[PDB]
């Protein structure tokens, strides 16, 4: 699981790998209200649930 803090993976004697997550989502933020709330749900789930 890659959190927003980022993940560092060291594999054997290789140099550690670093991974960070983007703001990818399936919804759209300029369409119908269900679409935009789904978008903000995929981005920030807890915050969007509490605010709605």
């Amino acid at each position: 699981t890659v959190p927003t803090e980022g993940l560092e993976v060291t594999w054997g004697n290789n140099e550690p790998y670093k991974y960070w997550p983007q703001l990818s989502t399936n919804g759209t933020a300029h369409g119908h209200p269900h679409e935009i709330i789904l978008y903000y749900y995929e981005l920030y789930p807890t915050m969007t649930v509490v605010v709605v």
């Binding site: 983007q22 990818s24 759209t28 933020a29």
Partner: protein, 439 residues
């Protein structure tokens, strides 16, 4: 001109600073922390290393009982075993079939490998932070190396720089650490002179070249086995040969905040905690007078395509009318949008192009282009890749204030509810007034 700014203590992300000295064209500084280092003040407690038991040749008395001596050696232990009858290769060593007593003695001492193979137990008092920085001073990359304790002002190209102190006193190390060769471990090693057998520190020494040795390995001798001249004993194995297999991961791999660890001296590089107060002293000659810089008019923007991914997913096109040719420092008035460039060349009746990185679903930001602002607006789209290998170029998560246009649904519904409540309140208050008029 003394300028003071604070940037987050994050390595490798090129930040931006604005120095708006009045009467002079605005100055944009692109500073990038190449490395920050924390170095605790060590205080060696003792040096541990694998011991060795020193067993001199046993003394076997052909007749009568040998006498046990006494010494002050670190773990000296003597014992007298009676009734022995040793055999050598040719025949019986002792003349008489009994009454022979063997004097077995042994003690411990540091091994020869203690010079090279050893583990140092220290104490970490307080780290003297140091830093190295890259700044695009006057549009050219220059590097600045200085301490980060609020002292040691450093100069380059006549411009002073003094950085720190770090807003975070957090250090990866604890009050006690050990180092083996390049690995450092936080562990609460036993007090000197009280090492338990088998565990780490059964034998302790102040320095590798010291002669005083404290060793607690419960060396116990045992009776020779049925006509042989050996000296057997029952000693707890080395606690350091055991620790070496039982080490576990060192701080290089377990420390938080993406902390690196080095040795000679022990450091902690590129920790991500806190922010860096960086204060510059930019001389008057560095600035250019405002009349010298050009003036831009009729600026119209456009965003052909935008994507709110990290690594500068947006691109904007701005028309211009720049009067004289010169260096037009470009800047972004909005925190949420970080434009890539720091200055471009403008002259004529044409347009330019920029790149920016944002986390907003709807672009809304003002571009400071050589004292003349401009408004840019576009709809950003989500990225296609779930994860990437670099930290986000843009500032941070958009705060709850900044939603996306077509949030107008929120305003619509809240206005409708407020309107309903308003008509309800007006009806109630007019009824209350007319009922107050009764009698």
């Amino acid at each position: 001109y003394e300028h003071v700014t604070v940037i987050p203590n994050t390595v490798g992300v090129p930040y931006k600073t604005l120095v708006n000295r009045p009467g002079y064209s605005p100055m944009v500084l692109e500073m990038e922390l190449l490395s920050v280092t924390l170095e605790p003040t060590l205080s060696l407690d003792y040096i541990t290393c694998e011991y060795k038991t020193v067993i001199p040749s046993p003394y076997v008395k052909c007749c009568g009982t040998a006498e046990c001596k006494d010494k002050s050696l670190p773990d000296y232990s003597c014992k007298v075993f009676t009734g022995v009858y040793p055999f050598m290769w040719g025949g019986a060593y002792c003349f008489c079939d009994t009454e022979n007593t063997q004097l077995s003695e042994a003690h411990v001492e540091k091994s020869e490998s203690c010079k090279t193979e050893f583990a140092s137990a220290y104490r970490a008092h307080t780290a003297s932070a140091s830093a190295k920085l890259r700044v695009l001073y006057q549009g050219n990359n220059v590097t600045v190396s200085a301490y980060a304790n609020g002292d040691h002002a450093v100069t380059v190209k006549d411009a002073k720089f003094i950085v720190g102190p770090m807003s975070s006193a957090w250090t990866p190390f604890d009050n006690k650490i050990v180092v083996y060769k390049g690995d450092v471990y936080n562990m609460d090693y036993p007090p000197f002179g009280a090492g338990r057998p088998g565990q780490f520190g059964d034998i302790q020494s102040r320095t590798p070249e010291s002669e005083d040795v404290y060793a607690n390995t419960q060396l116990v001798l045992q009776r020779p086995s049925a006509g042989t001249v050996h000296v057997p004993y029952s000693q707890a194995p080395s606690g350091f040969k055991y620790w070496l297999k039982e080490r576990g991961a060192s701080l290089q791999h377990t420390a938080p905040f993406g902390c690196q660890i080095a040795t000679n001296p022990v450091r902690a590089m590129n920790c991500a905690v806190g922010n860096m107060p960086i204060s510059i002293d930019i001389p008057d000659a560095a600035f250019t007078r405002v009349v010298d810089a050009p003036s831009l008019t009729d600026m119209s923007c456009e965003v052909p395509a935008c994507t709110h991914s990290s690594d500068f997913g947006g691109v904007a096109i701005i028309k211009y009318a720049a009067s004289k040719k010169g260096k037009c420092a470009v800047h972004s008035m909005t925190n949420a949008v970080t434009i890539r460039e720091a200055e471009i060349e403008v002259e004529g009746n044409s347009q330019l192009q920029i790149s920016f990185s944002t986390a907003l679903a709807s672009a809304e930001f003002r571009v400071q282009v050589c004292s003349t602002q401009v408004h840019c607006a576009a709809e950003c789209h989500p990225p296609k890749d779930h994860i990437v290998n670099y930290p986000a170029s843009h500032t941070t998560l958009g705060v709850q204030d900044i939603s996306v246009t077509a949030m107008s649904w929120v305003q619509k519904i809240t206005g409708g509810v407020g309107l309903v409540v308003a008509v309800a309140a007006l009806i109630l208050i007019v009824v209350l007034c007319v009922s107050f008029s009764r009698h």
